[PDB]
Write a protein that binds this ligand. Structure first.
Ligand SMILES: N[C@@H](CCC(=O)N[C@@H](CS)C(=O)NCC(=O)O)C(=O)O
Ligand SMILES: N[C@@H](CCC(=O)N[C@@H](CS)C(=O)NCC(=O)O)C(=O)O
Ligand SMILES: N[C@@H](CCC(=O)N[C@@H](CS)C(=O)NCC(=O)O)C(=O)O
Ligand SMILES: N[C@@H](CCC(=O)N[C@@H](CS)C(=O)NCC(=O)O)C(=O)O
Lengths: 219, 219
């Protein structure tokens, strides 16, 4: 209905739709973003459940692949680079050892960064009572995850050693949350300097900077 | 030294090492399980951090691929089926649409099931303070995830619809937690009958049943 290769179901504020948008833009692909209104329950409405039965964003429909539909941000991202980064600008080749190292880092992001950072967000902002021990638990886990990244990034430039890939990009949106709200003050920058430098440089890439400007705009 | 194709770093009780063991056994692969003693801090010791800097299990070393090492259970699983399930017994082919649907489900498991079930376990069993609102939050999230699975499994046999795959298997260890204590009583079986039946039948597969005996032995 719109002349773009993809329909992307997303959200204006949350990190995970922007994660996919970063990759779409890095790959030079066209997309129509449908921003769901969570306050109106649109992500739980039958119209969206037929797209993603989990009732969460993002979800992607590829109109140049017979409307193939896939959800989970990092599954979407793998689909996008495997099919549409054949020049390997921001990904490694399927069927190589490095591919499974890329995949390892993408799972660490999706299972180790996102959910735990998200529980810090939950207890700090949304939970109906203030539970300092829960807030502290998840802040400490954010710092533990950052420490893992720091242990690697202090010794090599990027996660899949030689070049920036979607494995690196996948951590950006949630780490921007750590930088701006989930940790107090400048703790991200001063406690994890190698990670903070890597993060900053990725955000300055032209496609990522473009997406981040758009995120600020739609807000 | 042990003569097996793989070294698997694991834990006797937690779900995520067993997840990989299921796949190793389904594929008829040989492996030496090294059960780390978390009470002794073995998962945080410098020698294990050289294997997985995250300091969590599982991690896999493939001695028939020049000691290629990969961590994150679902990255390990993908490596194993892509390289060693060319007969497509329990996986779909790389480079197909269905591969990315399999991947979607694997990411839903790793990011949507495991972390959230794990926080139910944390608040119910390990957090110093008993926090009823946190316990309720994660019990409700277990049920929400089970409802997603139910919505699919009540309409088709397996997740990647007609074939049992590692996408289905990946849910087993944490759903066994739901079945046996994380949800009290018979809530799992009564409230999610299609999911419970699918779970039961998967545990009856010969390879998985064998793994479950090992899990019982070491308990
Ligand atoms: N692991 C999922 C997480 C998706 C997720 O957390 N989405 C959020 C927005 S950032 C959402 O839709 N939240 C609505 C809700 O769950 O109520 C992925 O990476 O796609
Ligand atoms: N229904 C959600 C609402 C909040 C939500 O969706 N949070 C997202 C971020 S927008 C989250 O924590 N996602 C986890 C992840 O990214 O893995 C909940 O109860 O946590
Ligand atoms: N997303 C990771 C989760 C791994 C995980 O939670 N491992 C647990 C055992 S079930 C662990 O090593 N826990 C020790 C710790 O974190 O202190 C994966 O699927 O491999
Ligand atoms: N350091 C861990 C200790 C407990 C732990 O490792 N729990 C594992 C299960 S053994 C977990 O919840 N893993 C989450 C997952 O499987 O994604 C924590 O603070 O949560």
């Amino acid at each position: 209905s719109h002349g773009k290769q993809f329909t992307l179901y997303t959200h204006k504020g949350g990190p995970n739709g922007w994660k996919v948008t970063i990759v779409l833009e890095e790959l030079g692909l066209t997309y129509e973003s449908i921003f769901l209104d969570f306050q109106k329950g649109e992500h739980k409405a039958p119209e969206y459940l037929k797209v993603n039965p989990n009732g969460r964003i993002p979800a992607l429909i590829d109109h140049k692949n017979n409307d193939y539909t896939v959800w989970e941000s990092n599954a979407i991202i793998q689909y996008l680079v495997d099919k549409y980064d054949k020049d390997r600008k921001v990904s490694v080749a399927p069927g190589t050892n490095e591919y499974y190292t890329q995949l390892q880092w993408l799972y660490f992001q999706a299972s180790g960064q996102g959910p735990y950072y998200g529980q810090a967000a939950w207890f700090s902002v949304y939970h109906p009572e203030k539970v300092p021990s829960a807030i502290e638990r998840y802040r400490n886990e954010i710092k533990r995850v950052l420490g893992v990244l720091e242990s690697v990034l202090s010794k090599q430039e990027f996660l899949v050693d030689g070049k920036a890939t979607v494995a690196d990009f996948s951590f950006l949106p949630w780490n921007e949350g750590a930088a701006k709200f989930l940790l107090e003050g400048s703790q991200f920058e001063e406690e994890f300097p190698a990670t903070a430098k890597w993060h900053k440089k990725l955000l300055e890439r032209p496609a990522i900077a473009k997406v981040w400007e758009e995120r600020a705009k739609v807000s």
